[PDB]
Design a binder for this molecule. Structure first.
Ligand SMILES: Cc1cn([C@H]2C[C@H](O)[C@@H](COP(=O)(O)OP(=O)(O)OP(=O)(O)O)O2)c(=O)[nH]c1=O
Ligand SMILES: Cc1cn([C@H]2C[C@H](O)[C@@H](COP(=O)(O)OP(=O)(O)OP(=O)(O)O)O2)c(=O)[nH]c1=O
Ligand SMILES: [Mg+2]
Ligand SMILES: [Mg+2]
Lengths: 198, 198
């Protein structure tokens, strides 16, 4: 038996590269607020954990902060996935799956996460699949090109993201492609692809 | 509802400072193996995670490895607490509580865990109290003096523990005292104190 088992409505996950417009897309269901549970912009929690800016620390010193950061991302996603609600529909920005299959994986590849850190995170993900229920009915993939994404990221101008290189976005892009289109990672249940290049 | 809710027998937790003799004490129930579920010496898992020795890495470079290490200690304890069993009695060496109240706390105090890491771990502990069931009926506290503990630690001679100073054991001792005796924190579980100075 898993925590939050049979407590979640139909759930839609909004996925896409950084700056692909996941939040923008979600602001459209804004008026149906009292009929749909909307969990958006999780980044705000990561930028202020009792005063600490984990997102920034991670970008400045990955070798040391990538692990605690991803562990916190995992926790907050899990909290949203299992959050109680009455509404009949639930839509989330991001999910525990993109954190695992795209970000953690990429950080293992670029050396940000030493092997021992990668394994710890992976062991947590395995235990989570077995002890906690993660409702995932539909995934809307806002497909974009790394260049477009890079543009939007810079226009938003989050101080923490000021040093994010285009290669990084290209790596993340391929990883989203592998998971959501080609389905290389155990998921891709029901995916709806949308051209998010405006 | 919590994972593993109403699936656990009467559970006894064996606590005590490093080298207090928790494993030695547990080897005495060894013959009742087929009537009591015995989960001992969790350190072995921490010393070999798919080939990686987290325990060692933590002692050599705390600022960087204390967080992933404690996150893995938490995970394995949680796995033991929720492990399925038919037997009517369950006895464990250590628990998620000593990892939180004694080790994580001490590491926050000596600077091994930056505040951002401490908070991440604490947020996980809070989410765990609400989503997962941790059976705790009795806690046997093997009370010892830091000096005795230091002696046993070095007779055992674990390579990873070769640099553990007496002060460290004194700090851990007080923390065990505060929790299991003075009650300076979260636990309404019955405790049986045993003089473990042989
Ligand atoms: C989900 C996730 C995000 N992040 C980082 C990447 C970004 O700098 C920041 C937020 O990325 P996103 O989760 O993509 O959110 P966003 O608001 O930037 O996206 P959009 O414009 O489509 O609304 O968090 C990680 O480092 N790890 C993770 O596991
Ligand atoms: C539980 C726990 C142990 N440890 C470390 C301290 C030690 O070096 C090692 C094992 O400590 P203990 O958990 O005390 O186990 P032990 O086998 O050393 O004890 P005893 O002799 O009583 O059987 O793990 C942590 O760093 N963090 C933790 O949260
Ligand atoms: Mg967003
Ligand atoms: Mg032992």
């Amino acid at each position: 038996t898993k925590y939050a088992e049979g407590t979640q409505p139909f759930t839609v996950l909004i996925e896409g590269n950084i700056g692909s417009g996941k939040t923008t897309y979600l602001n459209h269901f804004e008026k149906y607020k009292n009929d749909i549970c909307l969990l958006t912009e999780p980044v705000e929690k990561w930028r202020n954990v009792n005063g600490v800016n984990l997102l920034e620390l991670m970008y400045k010193d990955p070798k040391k902060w990538a692990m605690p950061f991803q562990s916190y991302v995992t926790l907050t996603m899990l909290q949203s996935h299992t959050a109680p609600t009455n509404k009949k529909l639930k839509i989330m920005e991001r999910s525990i799956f993109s954190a695992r299959y795209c970000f953690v994986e990429n950080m293992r590849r670029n050396g940000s996460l030493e092997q021992g850190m990668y394994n710890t995170l992976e062991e947590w993900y395995k235990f989570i699949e077995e002890s906690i229920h993660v409702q995932a009915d539909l995934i809307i993939y806002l497909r974009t090109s790394p260049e477009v994404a890079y543009e939007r990221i810079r226009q938003r101008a989050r101080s923490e993201e000021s040093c994010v290189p285009l290669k990084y976005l290209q790596e993340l892009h391929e990883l989203h492609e592998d998971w959501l289109i080609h389905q290389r990672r155990p998921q891709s249940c029901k995916v709806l692809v949308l051209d998010a290049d405006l």
